[PDB]
């Protein structure tokens, strides 16, 4: 039962007027718990999960101070990158940063991450050993040189292996009622005739948490990918997820097909077969 805490930051420059749009969201596994939107009125880090509201004023004041500091760094970064890439001041660009840590089943630090993207492509990322950097190009290389000299990795590693994990464990405890609860997918199959000779069997997995899930179709006991379609896992909007996989089969032969659902919330995978 591994867990993770991740913070996602997106800054978009707006050359026409004003500062970059900055949006930060924090997540524990697949549950968002905080957010900061430079466009919002509060100008404060805000709760997005009931269990984080428990935190006192100092928490919110500190997260706000830190997230505002983050937005300013991104603001500067947008300018720095514009220069490194010799880009015009008139265009809008995007800097993204994601970082966080994972704790393993033993509840101890498993891994940390801290990566950055510029205009949707890898820019620089801390490697798994949390001691070296992966720079995608020469702009990133310059950042890498500066970060190595400033020993940024060491500082990050301390947060990722210490603070990050400590708070992740704190949130997990505080919101254990949901965070440490798996919601097994509620499954069912629907049948839709597409012609007189063919039908579509759609296997639904609903209201599950976490988002990770596998739906596979088998025909007579062997996996079938042809004649199938599986939509990307999507949020139901109430904190759970949905997904479905479908297969077109010869009408009358529905019994040969089985839908297999694997999910952390299921002791053993579920197998569905049309009525």
């Amino acid at each position: 039962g591994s867990h993770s805490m991740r913070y996602f930051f997106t800054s978009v420059s707006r050359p026409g007027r004003g500062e970059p749009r900055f949006i930060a969201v924090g997540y524990v596994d697949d549950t968002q718990f905080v957010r900061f939107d430079s466009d919002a009125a509060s100008q404060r880090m805000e709760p997005r999960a009931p269990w984080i509201e428990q935190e006192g004023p100092e928490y919110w004041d500190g997260e706000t101070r830190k997230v505002k500091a983050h937005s300013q760094t991104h603001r500067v970064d947008l300018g720095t990158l514009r220069g490194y890439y010799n880009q015009s001041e008139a265009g809008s660009h995007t800097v993204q940063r994601m970082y966080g840590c994972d704790v393993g089943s033993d509840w101890r630090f498993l891994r940390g991450y801290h990566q950055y993207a510029y205009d949707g492509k890898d820019y620089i990322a801390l490697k798994e050993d949390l001691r070296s950097w992966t720079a995608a190009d020469m702009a990133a290389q310059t950042t890498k040189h500066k970060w190595e000299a400033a020993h940024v990795a060491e500082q990050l590693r301390a947060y990722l292996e210490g603070t990050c994990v400590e708070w992740l464990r704190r949130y997990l405890e505080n919101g254990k009622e949901t965070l440490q609860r798996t919601d097994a997918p509620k499954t069912h199959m629907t049948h839709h005739a597409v012609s007189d000779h063919e039908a579509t069997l759609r296997c639904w997995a609903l209201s599950f948490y976490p988002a990770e899930i596998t739906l596979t179709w088998q025909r007579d006991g062997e996996d079938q990918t042809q004649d199938t379609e599986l939509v990307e896992t999507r949020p139901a909007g109430d904190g759970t997820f949905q997904k479905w996989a479908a297969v077109v089969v010869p009408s009358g032969q529905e019994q040969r097909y089985t839908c297999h659902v694997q999910h952390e919330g299921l002791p053993k995978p579920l197998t569905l077969r049309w009525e």
Binding site: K66, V76, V95, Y99, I124
Partner: peptide, 9 residues
């Protein structure tokens, strides 16, 4: 909890 210091690119 967010990281404290963020180094510029």
């Amino acid at each position: 909890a967010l990281y404290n210091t963020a180094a510029a690119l």
